[model samples]
Target chain A: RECCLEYFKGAIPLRKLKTWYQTSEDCSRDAIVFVTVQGRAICSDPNNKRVKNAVKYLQSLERS
Target chain B: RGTNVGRECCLEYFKGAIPLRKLKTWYQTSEDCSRDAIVFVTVQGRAICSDPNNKRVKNAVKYLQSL
Candidate 1:
């Protein structure tokens, strides 16, 4: 399947199953337990301020 | 099947506990957001931000009871 088109023609549905987390809940256990396809980027500080902020915001509502 | 709200916020499903070391703490001044702690936080998340007053606890209890 052609998830991220860095290549070319392929199926869709992207990553097939995606992990869904709300951006409002408190950052407790498994703070971000479903960020499956975190890509292949190499951040100097994955746990940097930006990451924390994003995690904080992402800890919101839970969808069904 | 498991979420923070029967449908949890998206995290690493984007959501648990046990079996691993402590989670990544964004800041060195915070505590773990364990499931139980989170429930206490959301229901009482505001409490951690201010002075601890007896009324807050009582009020929280009442509000949660109402929930």
Candidate 2:
């Protein structure tokens, strides 16, 4: 498994995201990896407000 | 934030099935990965790469998530 050793500092448009998952704690830094519809993996800081909001949005999509 | 990042993708895979009890955690590779893979970290801290399509790998993932 590839770990997100670094994260993207900029915000990603949520509409482009296809899926998201968390990095293992075994990684040096924890991150939320957001995969785009085009299959690009964008690593984001899990604690960031924007990231938190995006995660909530994605989770809501799963339930609906 | 550094430009030098550690290798995240599994370049190779373990050929045989590992006991479920030996696995500690697992995660899916990013879409950017060349080969779609499910990485299983063993209790010994070794990372084992396996095909996600494999029956044993599929069940292993389900078993780990249920925990």
Candidate 3:
């Protein structure tokens, strides 16, 4: 079934994600985390709570 | 399930991230309405605009959000 990979493809990577966040008006992690698709995108920062939740949500949506 | 209220919510969310002129350009020129332009209620009680079906709108939104 269609899932995360089928939908949101490619990734900015954590390093690039952070840098791109910097380009925004707000640069804090919370601001950055809030804006991007938190629980959906391929996140490199695995330890972040935002990343964990997004991953879990995708896991739930994945077909069995 | 789309409504004027939903459009308002979408406008609000996009306004925070983009300017009105640019938004109009995407909303119009991209022909997203004819395509599978996505509009959904975000968890934040607002509408989220996903125009992946229209690349111009998608890129415009990303570009503006990055500003």
| Highest-TM-score candidate | 2
Position B40, candidate 3: lDDT: 30
Native-to-model Cα distance after best TM-score fit, residue B28 in candidate 2, in Å: 10
| Span of 10 residues, lowest total lDDT, candidate 1 chain A | A1-10
Candidate 1's chain A scores what TM-score? 0.26
Candidate 3, position B30, lDDT: 19
On TM-score, who's better, 2 or 3?
Answer: 2
Off by over 4 Å in 3: A1-64, B1-45
Worst 10 residues of 2 chain A by lDDT: A20-29
What does fnat come to for each candidate? 0.00, 0.19, 0.00
lDDT of 1 by residue, A15-44 (tens): 421222222223432222223242121111
Superior by lDDT: candidate 1 or candidate 2: 2
Task: Assess each model's interface with DockQ, reporting 2 decimals per model.
Answer: 0.05, 0.12, 0.04
Scored against the true structure, residue B54 in model 3 reaches a CA lDDT of 55
Summarize candidate 2's per-residue lDDT along A1-64 as a digit string, tens digits: 4556466767678898766666564552567766566545566777899989998898799786
| Candidate number that wins on DockQ, 1 or 2 | 2
lDDT of 1 at A24: 28
Query: What's model 2's lDDT at A25?
Result: 48
